[PDB]
Amino acid sequence: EEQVKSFLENMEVECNYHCYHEKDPDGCYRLVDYLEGIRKNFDEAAKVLKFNCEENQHSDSCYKLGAYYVTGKGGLTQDLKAAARCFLMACEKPGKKSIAACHNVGLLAHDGQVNEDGQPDLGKARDYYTRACDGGYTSSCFNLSAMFLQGAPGFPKDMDLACKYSMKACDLGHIWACANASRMYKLGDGVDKDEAKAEVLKNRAQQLH
């Protein structure tokens, strides 16, 4: 039906009005959904995302924009540092993508390439992974646990926290966290020795997978 097409194509006009003239951040985000899922025009999706993140500071737009920057989508040059900036905005400004954005901030900061000297910044990684971990993002809890198992030039090893975040990871589903947590309770590495729980943790780890 040509009316259904017409009513559909008019949603774009209305979203353009709300975005380009009222500057409604949610209007701009609606426009993006439209440009991606209906028109499949990612180069135009990119421009709106750019406006909506940089000018309107819309969290979910910043997230999506960072995702585009990782691969160079919609005409954007592939750019990890910009991806990082966008994910930082989205993690900080609360939205539906924040938790996922926080994990990404931790990962990139841990790994270091986007830091101003190219080195790891585990201090920053910890703060952003902590938010992610408390929101249920299992890899944040694990990557955070691993940081405390290992330690590094400016980041001391700490079994107490290592065990704590292994536990949160193991709760949420993570095999290697249950296994690492088992040999901490069995030994008493930064936690009081408990051999019943240690056997439980080993069993939880074999059970998972």
Side-chain angles (χ1 to χ4, degrees), residues 1-182 184-196 198 200-209:
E1 188 49 78
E2 291 217 294
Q3 296 308 80
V4 156
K5 166 168 78 94
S6 94
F7 285 17
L8 186 69
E9 87 196 1
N10 203 58
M11 286 174 163
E12 190 170 11
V13 178
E14 206 178 338
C15 288
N16 284 321
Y17 165 64
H18 293 309
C19 184
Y20 279 74
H21 295 266
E22 294 182 323
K23 301 157 170 54
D24 173 22
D26 275 290
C28 291
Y29 194 71
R30 270 291 193 92
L31 182 57
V32 168
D33 293 337
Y34 186 95
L35 290 170
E36 296 182 330
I38 304 297
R39 269 195 59 74
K40 307 275 164 43
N41 187 348
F42 301 108
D43 296 67
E44 271 290 326
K47 301 317 298 171
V48 174
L49 281 170
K50 211 169 194 299
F51 169 70
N52 215 38
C53 176
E54 299 179 345
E55 315 315 281
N56 297 140
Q57 312 207 332
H58 180 258
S59 163
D60 291 352
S61 285
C62 285
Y63 173 82
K64 211 165 220 173
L65 185 53
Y68 277 48
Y69 274 120
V70 175
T71 60
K73 206 190 185 116
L76 295 172
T77 81
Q78 177 167 318
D79 190 344
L80 200 56
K81 282 177 172 194
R85 285 192 260 110
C86 292
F87 293 138
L88 188 82
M89 293 164 193
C91 171
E92 290 188 345
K93 307 265 155 197
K96 307 172 194 266
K97 310 295 183 206
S98 294
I99 294 303
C102 301
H103 172 72
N104 303 351
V105 169
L107 185 62
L108 295 182
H110 173 283
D111 287 6
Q113 316 100 294
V114 306
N115 291 317
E116 289 283 359
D117 58 12
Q119 278 293 291
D121 185 345
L122 301 104
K124 174 168 171 177
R126 182 200 170 155
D127 293 321
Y128 287 86
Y129 276 152
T130 300
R131 176 169 285 169
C133 181
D134 297 336
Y137 209 93
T138 308
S139 304
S140 302
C141 303
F142 182 72
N143 300 351
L144 186 54
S145 81
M147 284 164 59
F148 292 135
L149 261 46
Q150 297 277 313
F155 201 82
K157 176 193 247 72
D158 177 331
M159 294 297 169
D160 204 284
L161 293 170
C163 173
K164 181 198 190 187
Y165 287 111
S166 298
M167 292 280 84
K168 284 153 157 281
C170 177
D171 170 334
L172 291 161
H174 202 88
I175 292 145
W176 300 324
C178 300
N180 290 339
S182 195
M184 294 171 101
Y185 276 116
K186 197 188 79 222
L187 268 55
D189 268 294
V191 65
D192 52 2
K193 199 200 289 180
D194 193 337
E195 316 98 65
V200 166
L201 297 180
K202 198 142 59 55
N203 294 349
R204 217 232 199 291
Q206 311 300 169
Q207 178 220 326
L208 297 162
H209 99 322

